[PDB]
Amino acid sequence: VTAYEEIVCQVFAAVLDRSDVTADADFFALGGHSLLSLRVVARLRALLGVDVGVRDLFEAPTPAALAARLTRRPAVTRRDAPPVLSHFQRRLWLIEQVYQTRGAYNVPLAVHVSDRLDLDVLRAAVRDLVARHEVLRTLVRSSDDGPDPVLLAPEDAAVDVAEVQAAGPVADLLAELTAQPFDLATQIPLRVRMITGEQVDGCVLLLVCHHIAADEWSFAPLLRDLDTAYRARAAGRAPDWEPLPAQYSDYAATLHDWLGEATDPASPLRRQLDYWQHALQDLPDELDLPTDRPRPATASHRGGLARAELPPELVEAVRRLAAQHGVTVFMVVQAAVAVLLHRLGAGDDIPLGSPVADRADEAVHDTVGFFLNTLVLRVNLSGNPTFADLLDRVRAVDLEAFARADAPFDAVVDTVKPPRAVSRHPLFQTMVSYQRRPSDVDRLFGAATRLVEVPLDTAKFDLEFAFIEDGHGGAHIALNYAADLFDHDSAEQLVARLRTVLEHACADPCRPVA
Ligand SMILES: *P(=O)(O)OCC(C)(C)[C@@H](O)C(=O)NCCC(=O)NCCNC(=O)[C@@H](N)CC(C)C
């Protein structure tokens, strides 16, 4: 979970009257002292509702260490250790067997480079990246009882690096290259394409990963390691890196041993499952939402991407609104989405899905892998509350849920036992997330670089709203919608309505949600 770290950050910022609080910054180095520690403790007790003391701040003076302290799980330890498929990976493999996802669970990473890179040096750099991170060369075979991992040696890991000439626009080409299917049993879950053309000034570097090997949080380590490996091979040298604290299989083995078995009543898995069974009781099968077409018998996973650019003034107003009411920016976006669905006639019981990153352990905080568990955040909007009252409801719902974020979502589905159907995702069909793209990626590969948005031809749910920060000040709302249900114009209107909800909430949080 990251919400604790963000809350401690804004409490640091407010108490210090300071606007450069990072996760690893020391409280006393930023200008804090003993008297100011009282305000940090008091504010963290009122916001997180956990017993915090002055001693906790002195022993854990950074927002990352303090957040971890405030939340018995063994640390990740290293282990030719055999690969261990995490429950995320098994569930991601499973969704490709249940549905034809059309590449919806491929994650893209597109970087425009002012110079056309050297394909041979790039291929060598990718081989080094694949050799460093075992999860990028871990195959998944379908056996009798399900998935079985196969780790390829670096010499046997045949990388997929190629140059593609773009006659067409270039943004449409990225969509289609992203959705190209992976054969998880034979091909490594990483494809690399270099797009050049007469309309492409320089080149566009596209990293297509299957989610089984990487989440959106892996963008920073992927780019950093690929940059250092490219600049080393360009200089005729193997990259010289500090060894990895752990591979993904180390994290997976540690997590599953600590999770325990669902039959053990005292295991963390069972105790968290019992919470979700009660928290998700009498859940709506599906929210009644106005769609352009009725739900088809099978979710085709066809989709589009509607974007809403946010003005910098609104982004800061959202930041100010979050710090004002003691909630994270995600909680404001999640409350705004709930208001939007409520005003569309969905009712007072709004279950929204949301990803929660399991990157608290410092050995996996900056590593490549999939750490996003899916949680059902069930917010109630009865009693015609104000947006401020809703922000308090959302925080109470989120913090209670974030304390049980380790139960695998597939196990949660199995315990809640909703009416199953391949026409819809279970327990929720609208997901909301807050994402931050990597910062300081403007001067990579010895050139000028910038992340490029990839329009998607796929969708995982009915609706997926993401508050995406680009890493260099800007922010925008992305709505990944199912084309089976919504036309592109309807999605564009939906995301513009979400921005209006936020603008109205920042202006006056005392207005009723109705
Ligand atoms: P943070 O680390 O920034 O601040 C710590 C703080 C507030 C400086 C405390 O450590 C603190 O208050 N230190 C001073 C404590 C102190 O000096 N107590 C003695 C006060 N004098 C007496 O009590 C009196 N009996 C002296 C006798 C005559 C020896």
Q: What is the 3-state secondary structure (H, E, C) of 179-194?
A: CCCCCCCCCCCEEEEE
φ, ψ of residue 478 to 5 degrees: the values are: -115, 130
- Residue 278 Cβ inside 6 Å of ligand 1? The answer reads no
Which residues are paired to 373 by β-bridges?
356
| Length of the chain as a residue count | 514
- Enter the tokens of residue 183: 């054969």
Q: Which CATH class is domain 87-248?
A: alpha beta
By the 10 Å C-beta count (0-12 exposed, 13-18 middle, 19+ buried), 504 is classed as: middle
Please report, for residues 36, 277, 359, 406, 499, the alpha-carbon distance to residue 25 in angstroms, rounded to integers and kept in the order given. Answer: 16, 39, 18, 27, 32
- Residue 142 Cβ inside 6 Å of ligand 1? The answer reads no
C-alpha torsion sign, points 37, 402, 391, 393: negative
Best mutation site among 34, 40, 55 for ligand 1 pocket (most ligand atoms within 8 Å of CB): 34
**Contact assessment for residue 412 and residue 376, using Cβ atoms and an 8 Å cutoff:** yes
**Contact assessment for residue 303 and residue 455, using Cβ atoms and an 8 Å cutoff:** no
CA distance 115 to 124: 18
What is the 3-class SS of 250-290, one letter each residue?
HHHHHHHHHHCCCCCCCCHHHHHHHHHHHHCCCCCCCCCCC
- Residue 34 Cβ inside 6 Å of ligand 1? The answer reads yes
CA distance 2 to 224: 22
First to last CA, the chain: 31
Taking Cα atoms as reference points, which of 257, 224, 220 lies closest to residue 239?
A: 224
Three-class secondary structure of residue 297 per DSSP: coil
Cβ-Cβ contacts under 8 Å for 474 (sequence gap 6 or more): 310, 312, 315
Taking Cα atoms as reference points, which of 418, 428, 435, 445 lies closest to residue 374?
A: 428
* CA 34–ligand 1 middle distance (angstroms): 12
- Residue 38 Cβ inside 6 Å of ligand 1? The answer reads no
103-114 CB burial, b ≥16 within 10 A, e <16:
bbbbbbbbbbbe
Long-range contacts of 16-21 (CB under 8 A, 24+ apart): 21/63
Cβ-Cβ contacts under 8 Å for 450 (sequence gap 6 or more): 111, 112, 441, 442
Cβ-Cβ contacts under 8 Å for 383 (sequence gap 6 or more): none
Superfamily of domain covering 2-71:
ACP-like (1.10.1200.10)
**Contact assessment for residue 480 and residue 307, using Cβ atoms and an 8 Å cutoff:** no
In angstroms, how far is CA 355 from the centroid of its own chain? 6
CA distance 187 to 157: 9
**Contact assessment for residue 352 and residue 431, using Cβ atoms and an 8 Å cutoff:** yes
CA distance 190 to 209: 4
- Enter the tokens of residue 51: 């017993």
CA distance 251 to 291: 41
Taking Cα atoms as reference points, which of 385, 331, 289, 323 lies closest to residue 502?
A: 331
Taking Cα atoms as reference points, which of 174, 378, 388 lies closest to residue 281?
A: 378
Three-class secondary structure of residue 344 per DSSP: coil
Pairing of strands 160-165, 190-197: parallel
- Within 13 A of 270's CA, how many CA atoms are on the CB side? 8
Segment holding 112, helix H or strand E: strand 106-113
The DSSP letter of residue 367 is: S
Best mutation site among 16, 26, 30, 33 for ligand 1 pocket (most ligand atoms within 8 Å of CB): 33
Annotated binding site for (R)-4'-phosphopantetheine: 34
Q: How many CB atoms lie within 10 A of CB 494?
A: 23
- The structure tokens 């800007």 sit at 474
- The structure tokens 């999605």 sit at 491
- Residue 31 Cβ inside 6 Å of ligand 1? The answer reads no
Binning the chain into helix, strand and coil, the percentages to the nearest 5 are 40, 20, 45
Taking Cα atoms as reference points, which of 417, 345, 420, 424 lies closest to residue 381?
A: 345
Q: Say whether 87-248 and 2-71 share the same fold.
A: no
CA dihedral 293, 297, 302, 306 (to 10 degrees): 40
C-alpha torsion sign, points 168, 170, 175, 181: positive
By the 10 Å C-beta count (0-12 exposed, 13-18 middle, 19+ buried), 357 is classed as: middle
CA dihedral 211, 216, 218, 222 (to 10 degrees): 90
DSSP of 193-220: EEEEETTEEEEEEEEEEETTT--GGGHH
Taking Cα atoms as reference points, which of 9, 13, 60, 15 lies closest to residue 38?
A: 15
